[PDB]
């Protein structure tokens, strides 16, 4: 309730670039505090690349300029230079670079989940996906494509789309979700920044990272599960190594489920199942302590959840589930459920920790409903944490102050909070609105 | 009681606070004038003095149920219009009579998966047009049939996008045609021979991921109206496949984020916006299938029965059948589904104003009486059978001072009952 909603800061990008599809805080120290915005449809100065996508750096102080991860066009096949006509070995056009943007310390991870390549054998069109990792404040740039392996095509990791979802741990470990691996069984892959740089050799296209953790191929009964559709991190195993939370929205007869994996050996620890078929339970996941007991609690979104009005009419509203952790573990059934009230509102499409917004000792949460509102522009709900868990009523409701237009705004489809952008002691919030190519920054004012 | 505890300062306030309250006008009564209808006479209040406005029920349109007639000339529900004046907290109940028509036309649209796993199936359907039309001849005197095909969204990663695989998504020997979202091969017609002719020309296709994009097609069939040629009769949509289904959210893998708009986008009988709009959600299909009165028959293989069994529970007016190896049993499947769908009625009402509530009580054959959510439906309704519903409406506020109106209708029919509401707020 202490976010400055009457006058937020609006960042604007190029038209049609989907500027705001992904948002993130960047701070190599404190002096260079900045906002990162992904624009997956942005045109770039890369030669021969159409709408390669871009990431914009927006320093906070007094605007936005694109970061140059890769200035090169699509590389050429080795043996094509023998034949009559050079041909690309990869396809960076329409790769959606910047679909996911995450940062940890002076490192920035930007992913292109629709990046595809030919392979150097039989011609394919494998969307293996790729990520670029900047380190030490843009002094070294690395490419990281863990799914670009010996095992090609849908049967292997050819359609992995690695980087479709991503996140950093507290130690800076990279965690990637690739929902397309092994006939869309899905896959989690992870490697330390040291491990990635140690085996980085751009002359060879295939990934050779040693010590890399990754989930294993299962039987065909698990196909089309989209494991790794969304990802988050949090401690759930009782040690000091953050664990991996992964959404599996089409698992178990498309009732969907969320899984927690051991950050040490990626082995499965817990499962949480949805309550309705094709509700997309696991569309979005988050981990944060919402009741100040020191144990990270789980939040899951199911934006297609369909309930009935009192007069008997069905309606798509969406629903969020909260699982409170306790010293013995976690219960499979939710402690609390939050239900949207806007038809086709898609409540629970995005979730982000807010830290402690009002400094009352309990961390708070923001939940997006990209198509909520009286004009379907989108809405963001702030829910207060407390000793009994998250509150069932919002403490604040954020909406765009600009008028609706010919196209949806998608306001609230991308969220990021839990960090202090201006150093006033109160955490702040970034809201994406890529439909109109805008990102909004809400600041926490000291209030009562 | 709550009549005295209301402290009614006028005749008006007394009415909206409790249905059991009356107002004394005598001036010989020793806010105490607002008491129970019994508590006033016990205190010496003349009945000619106790003002007590009461709700009422007035039928306005009441064509009797029917027993050579056009579909619009057939009455299956009565009354068709009535007025209910509502006292706050006092329910008004009225009877709804439903009768299943003797002979009613049928539109059946056959929407078929033409992905590669449906290769052997397409060969058996070569005579489905004339064979089905023969069977329906002993069910209805007016039958029409249509045919549509679907595969998948025409974008990465759902299809392979190499130039060769775009021309032929299958192997070299296999002469598969290019992948396509949805094709309206044949609009509804009474010529079964044309169905055989055009279905016999269609070519099997293919794609990459096992779940297919039939939901995009179902949506189009549901909302495209005249392009399909739906009549205001029994509308059957047979959905034949051997795979699971994509739904909203799956589109995001291909960068498709716009929700389905539920609008018609056929150009040259081809769906042209599969690359632009995401797959519909089940809830979105529920809305549009119901709105356009489409009754869905899911003719799916044995292994996907569990999935489509759950889908049927979510979709009103839908049925599931086990499709044989290559659609050899599809006709009997359709007949069994129709008999099941037509023998059950389900009532739905429009949105009510806040403070207003509705309740159903069904009275079916063999003395089977339903209440709660079961009060909305009757089953085992044979041809010519009559069932009745007792429908109560109660207002607990004073919504507006203007009259409200909403419709009650059985799913799958244009016929409806217009219920006009009027609220007693003053004496």
């Amino acid at each position: 309730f202490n976010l400055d909603a009457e006058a937020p800061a609006v960042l604007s990008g190029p038209p049609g670039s989907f500027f705001g599809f992904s948002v993130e805080f960047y701070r190599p120290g404190t002096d260079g505090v900045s906002v990162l915005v992904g624009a997956p449809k942005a045109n770039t100065s890369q030669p021969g690349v159409l709408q390669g996508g871009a990431v914009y750096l927006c320093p906070w102080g007094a605007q936005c300029t694109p970061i140059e991860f890769d200035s090169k066009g699509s590389r050429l096949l080795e043996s094509s230079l023998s034949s009559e006509g050079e041909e690309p070995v990869e396809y960076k056009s329409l790769q959606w670079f910047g679909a996911t943007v995450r940062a940890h310390g002076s490192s920035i991870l930007a992913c292109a989940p629709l990046y595809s390549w030919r392979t150097e054998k039989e011609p394919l069109s494998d969307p293996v996906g790729t990520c670029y990792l900047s380190t030490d404040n843009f002094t070294r740039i690395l490419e990281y494509a863990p799914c670009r392996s010996d095992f090609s095509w849908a049967a292997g990791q050819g359609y992995c789309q690695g980087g479709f979802s991503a996140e950093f741990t507290k130690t800076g470990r990279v965690v990637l979700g690739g929902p397309g691996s092994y006939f869309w069984q899905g896959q989690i892959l992870s490697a330390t920044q040291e491990q990635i740089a140690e085996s980085y050799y751009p002359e060879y296209l295939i990934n050779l990272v040693q010590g890399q953790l990754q989930t294993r191929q299962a039987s065909s009964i698990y196909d089309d599960s989209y494991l790794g559709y969304s990802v988050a991190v949090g401690e759930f195993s009782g040690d000091d190594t953050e664990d991996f939370v992964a959404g599996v929205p089409k698992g178990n007869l498309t009732y969907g489920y969320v899984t927690i994996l051991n950050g040490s050996d990626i082995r499965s620890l817990y499962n949480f199942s949805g309550e309705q078929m094709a509700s997309y339970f696991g569309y979005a996941v988050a981990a944060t302590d919402v009741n100040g007991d020191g144990l990270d609690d789980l939040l899951v979104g199911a934006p297609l959840l369909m309930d009935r009005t009192p007069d008997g009419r069905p309606q798509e509203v969406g629903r969020v589930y909260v699982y409170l952790q306790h010293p013995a573990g976690i219960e499979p059934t939710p402690t609390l459920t939050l239900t949207g009230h806007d038809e086709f509102g898609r409540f629970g499409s995005s979730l982000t920790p807010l830290g402690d917004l009002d400094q009352d000792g309990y961390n708070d949460v923001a939940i997006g409903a990209p198509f909520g509102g009286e004009t379907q522009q989108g809405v963001v709900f702030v829910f207060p944490g407390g000793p009994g868990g998250l509150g069932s009523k919002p403490s604040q409701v954020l909406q765009p102050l600009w008028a609706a237009s010919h196209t949806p705004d998608f306001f609230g489809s991308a969220l990021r909070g839990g960090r202090d952008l201006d150093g006033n002691g109160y955490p702040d919030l970034i809201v994406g609105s890529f439909g109109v190519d805008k990102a909004v920054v809400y600041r926490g004012r000291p209030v009562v | 009681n709550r009549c005295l505890k209301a402290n009614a300062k006028s005749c008006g306030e007394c009415i909206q606070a409790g249905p059991n309250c009356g107002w004394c006008t005598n001036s010989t009564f020793l806010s105490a004038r607002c008491d129970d209808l019994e508590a006033l006479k016990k205190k010496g209040c003349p009945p000619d003095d106790i003002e007590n406005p009461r709700g009422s029920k007035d039928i306005k349109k009441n064509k009797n149920v029917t027993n050579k007639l056009k579909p619009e000339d057939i009455t299956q529900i009565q009354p068709q219009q009535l007025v209910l004046r509502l006292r706050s907290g006092e329910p008004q109940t009225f009877t709804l009579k439903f009768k299943r028509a003797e002979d009613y036309p049928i539109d059946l649209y056959y929407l078929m998966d033409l992905s590669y796993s449906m290769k052997d199936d397409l060969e058996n359907v070569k005579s489905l047009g004339t064979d089905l039309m023969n069977e329906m001849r002993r069910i209805t005197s007016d039958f029409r049939i249509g045919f549509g095909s679907f595969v998948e969204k025409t974008v990465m990663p759902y299809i392979s996008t190499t130039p060769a695989k775009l021309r032929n998504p299958c192997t070299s020997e296999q002469n598969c045609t290019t992948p396509f979202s949805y094709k309206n091969v044949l609009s509804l017609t009474n010529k079964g021979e044309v169905f055989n002719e055009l279905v016999g020309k269609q070519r099997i296709s293919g794609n990459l991921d096992s779940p297919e994009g039939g939901f995009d097609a179902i949506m189009q069939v549901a909302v495209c109206g005249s392009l399909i040629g739906w009549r205001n009769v029994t509308r059957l949509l047979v959905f034949s496949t051997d795979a699971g289904f994509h739904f909203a959210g799956d589109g995001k893998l291909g960068g498709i984020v716009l929700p389905n708009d539920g609008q018609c986008h056929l150009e040259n009988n081809m769906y042209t916006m599969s690359h632009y709009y995401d797959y519909p959600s089940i809830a979105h299909l529920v809305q549009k299938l119901s709105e356009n009165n489409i009754q869905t028959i899911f003719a799916v293989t044995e292994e996907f029965q569990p999935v489509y069994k759950e889908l049927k529970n979510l979709i009103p007016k839908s049925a599931v059948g086990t499709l044989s190896a290559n659609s050899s049993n599809v006709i009997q499947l359709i007949i069994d589904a129709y008999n099941s769908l037509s023998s059950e009625v389900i009532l739905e009402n429009g949105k009510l104003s806040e403070g207003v509530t509705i309740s159903y009580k069904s009275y079916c054959k063999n003395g089977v009486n339903g209440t709660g959510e079961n009060g909305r439906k009757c089953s085992n309704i044979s041809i010519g059978d009559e069932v009745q519903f007792e429908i109560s409406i109660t207002s607990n506020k004073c919504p507006k001072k203007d009259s409200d109106s909403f419709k009650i209708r059985p799913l799958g029919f244009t016929e409806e009952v217009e219920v006009i509401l009027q609220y007693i707020c003053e004496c």
């Binding site: 849908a154 006939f183 065909s220 196909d223 | 590669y116 293919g206 794609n207 990459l208 991921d209 297919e212």
Partner: peptide
């Protein structure tokens, strides 16, 4: 029988 295949 994985993907779109019999």
């Amino acid at each position: 029988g994985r993907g779109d295949s019999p």
